[PDB]
Design an enzyme around this catalytic site. Sequence first.
Site, mmCIF file in Angstrom:
data_model
loop_
_atom_site.group_PDB
_atom_site.id
_atom_site.type_symbol
_atom_site.label_atom_id
_atom_site.label_comp_id
_atom_site.label_asym_id
_atom_site.label_seq_id
_atom_site.Cartn_x
_atom_site.Cartn_y
_atom_site.Cartn_z
ATOM 1 N N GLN A 133 0.820 -1.220 0.000
ATOM 2 C CA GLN A 133 0.000 0.000 0.000
ATOM 3 C C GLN A 133 0.844 1.255 0.000
ATOM 4 O O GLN A 133 2.035 1.212 0.295
ATOM 5 C CB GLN A 133 -0.944 0.025 1.223
ATOM 6 N N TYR B 131 -10.358 4.476 19.898
ATOM 7 C CA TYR B 131 -10.441 3.215 19.166
ATOM 8 C C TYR B 131 -9.609 2.141 19.830
ATOM 9 O O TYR B 131 -10.085 1.028 19.989
ATOM 10 C CB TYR B 131 -10.005 3.410 17.713
ATOM 11 N N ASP C 282 0.420 -0.430 13.811
ATOM 12 C CA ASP C 282 0.739 0.808 14.499
ATOM 13 C C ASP C 282 1.106 0.628 15.960
ATOM 14 O O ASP C 282 1.798 1.461 16.520
ATOM 15 C CB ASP C 282 -0.399 1.814 14.341
ATOM 16 N N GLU D 292 0.870 -8.812 11.236
ATOM 17 C CA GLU D 292 0.681 -7.665 10.351
ATOM 18 C C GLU D 292 1.419 -7.946 9.030
ATOM 19 O O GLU D 292 2.615 -8.208 9.039
ATOM 20 C CB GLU D 292 1.202 -6.403 11.075
ATOM 21 N N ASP E 167 0.506 -12.955 6.375
ATOM 22 C CA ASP E 167 -0.913 -12.932 6.048
ATOM 23 C C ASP E 167 -1.702 -13.589 7.190
ATOM 24 O O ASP E 167 -1.437 -14.741 7.551
ATOM 25 C CB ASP E 167 -1.128 -13.671 4.725
ATOM 26 N N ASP F 135 -7.726 -5.789 14.291
ATOM 27 C CA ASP F 135 -7.592 -4.372 14.056
ATOM 28 C C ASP F 135 -7.278 -4.161 12.593
ATOM 29 O O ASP F 135 -6.200 -3.703 12.246
ATOM 30 C CB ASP F 135 -6.501 -3.804 14.943
ATOM 31 N N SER F 136 -8.225 -4.535 11.737
ATOM 32 C CA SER F 136 -8.037 -4.459 10.300
ATOM 33 C C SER F 136 -9.333 -4.211 9.541
ATOM 34 O O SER F 136 -10.392 -4.745 9.903
ATOM 35 C CB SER F 136 -7.420 -5.761 9.791
ATOM 36 N N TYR G 218 -12.479 8.722 11.824
ATOM 37 C CA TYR G 218 -13.033 7.664 10.961
ATOM 38 C C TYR G 218 -14.263 8.212 10.252
ATOM 39 O O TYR G 218 -14.892 9.160 10.752
ATOM 40 C CB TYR G 218 -13.325 6.390 11.753
#
Lengths: 269, 269
Positions: free
Chosen positions: A32, A62, A87, A107, A138, A156-157, A212
Amino acid sequence: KKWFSEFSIMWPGQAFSLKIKKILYETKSKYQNVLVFESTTYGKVLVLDGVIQLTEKDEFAYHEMMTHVPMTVSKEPKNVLVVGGGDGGIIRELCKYKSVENIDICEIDETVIEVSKIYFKNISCGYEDKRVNVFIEDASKFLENVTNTYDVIIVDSSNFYEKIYNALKPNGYCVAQCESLWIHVGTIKNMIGYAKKLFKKVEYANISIPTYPCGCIGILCCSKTDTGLTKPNKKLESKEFADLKYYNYENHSAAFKLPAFLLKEIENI
Amino acid sequence: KKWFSEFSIMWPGQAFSLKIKKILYETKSKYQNVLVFESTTYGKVLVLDGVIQLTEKDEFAYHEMMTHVPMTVSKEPKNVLVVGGGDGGIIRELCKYKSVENIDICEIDETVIEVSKIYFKNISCGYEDKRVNVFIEDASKFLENVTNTYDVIIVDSSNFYEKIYNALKPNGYCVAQCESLWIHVGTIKNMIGYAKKLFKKVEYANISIPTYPCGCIGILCCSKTDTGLTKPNKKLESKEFADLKYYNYENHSAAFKLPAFLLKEIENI
């Protein structure tokens, strides 16, 4: 000065913008686009594929709600898995619990982790904790391959939920990021639909978070027990939790009290 | 197509934007600029001085919570006053109560009322109700001049609170729009400060609404009784309330459960 603007086909017709004080870093990783900037009023901002991942001003909302919801329900959680969340914010929240013996995080994109370690030191600080183990992988492959089961899985995705179920202990919990109630109600219905096939108690909660889309994000909550995730089994009273800024005993339960239109949608599921 | 964008020194550093399907009406009234447009995904939008006043998609959240909070606490409310709220949304919500005998509304700018009567017929429909009485007037002048006192005053806008207090019955309630907790906490502190001088119970609640800045707006709640506004005294069970889309018995109480950082701010007040 210049403005960052957030567009997407996931929420067409609207956009949210932050004024840029200065761009800090920018790259195209294997997975990305990654952008970091100091905004003028929200602190540092992390952007992935042109969508805000977090800002310093409001990230606690969050990360606290996603973590401390399931972690106050789980009685004695020893092994915890974060999927996504490069993060480190969830990890910062998990480390506060002394009973936790291990924290795994899977991650796919290590740039996210590395960038956050550099630019967001008050977010990524849990990585220096000895219990934490990082897996550049993955999630679907990690979950198929893992030999331990977990007390809590935090996604968290964003068959998968079959894998989550099998990776949890018989009394384990999963919380997954799950859309804004203002935009993707069909999706909320579908996620709840899938989870109810596997989990005996599926529940949806809502977090107020301005950066968000629509200013809020939901938490899909999955328990294997009859009891579910709406009632904490402990208060976070120790020195580690003195600095919490959003989550508390009462708002835990409150977050599950949804707008009537949503209840009406998710009743005949 | 083109985009409407919302800027302001009240929330510098951020903006929220909606795609314009087509502009419907536009004027400079004696008091403010007025813009109406069909957006592509939020229905019709009313803009005043370049700030979103309401959209069809989500207006119910704000109008239901602002109305049905105090109206389920008030036992037998007969006389109700709306300050501001030219759009009629609160009025639509008030008319649902059969016990209400009169509804006064004081709005300084009749263009707002007229535009809403024309373009927003599912919002401004309470104006056709015989109990409703419109006063094109400055609220401060209306409150100084009024001879009736009210069971409930709803301030749908933005010494004043001395006037509100004197215009309420000894057991009357006031709810006023009061900032987003994400941006103007000093202001929330000040408003609570002023109100506590006069009212024996001041309480703050939070509404999720995507098209207000930060995706939420607060309700300053003022009672003269010890009891306060967090607990309904009735359920809205009659046919008039079957179509409510946000407010319900449980989320009434839930809306008063605030983020820890806000509680910490409004404790030593």
